[PDB]
A = this chain, B = another copy of it.
Amino acid sequence: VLSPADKTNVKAAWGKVGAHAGEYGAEALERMFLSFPTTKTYFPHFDLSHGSAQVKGHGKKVADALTNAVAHVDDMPNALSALSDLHAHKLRVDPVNFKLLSHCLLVTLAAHLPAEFTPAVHASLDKFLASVSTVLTSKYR
């Protein structure tokens, strides 16, 4: 249940993220690979070293997806439909990993939003990322 209240807190917070979305996306991935090494099993074709252009590029795509989800927060299932299919039938990333990336995105946001990352916004963002994760795994089986 991403409440309307959560939706607007997310729109405002992500709005503040603004032009740094891609950077934060890449940073979140880097944090995930270091904090949770098991997530690296999904990127054997990537150089996962600090500064990797592949991690940076993928980060912009993850950010594109999140930005698009925020812009269509009232119908995320539709907005994330292509990605739900991709992760469910091709990538087949175990559902547990979405919580790991979500946590790293929160940490990244906390590290960049001193004033905005209040307890309430922290809760809304967590629920938002959980909602995104649920949508992305909705077609797994």
Contact residues in B for A1 (Cβ distance below 8 Å): 138-139, 141
**What is the size, in residues, of chain A's interface with B at 8 Å between Cβ atoms?**
6
Minimum CB distance partner of A127 in chain B: B141
Contact residues in B for A127 (Cβ distance below 8 Å): 141
* Interface residue SS majority, chain A: loop
With the chains together, A1 CA to B84 CA distance in Å?
A: 13
Q: From residue 1 to 60 of chain A, which have CB atoms closer than 8 A to chain B?
A: 1
A113 within 8 A of B: no
With the chains together, A127 CA to B141 CA distance in Å?
A: 8
From residue A47, how far is it (CB to closest CB) to chain B in Å?
A: 35
Minimum CB distance partner of A6 in chain B: B141
Interface centre among A1, A123, A127, A139 (most CB of B within 10 A): A1
Interface residues of A (CB under 8 A from B): 1, 123, 127, 138-139, 141
5 contacts between A and B (CB under 8 A): A1-B138, A1-B139, A1-B141, A123-B141, A127-B141
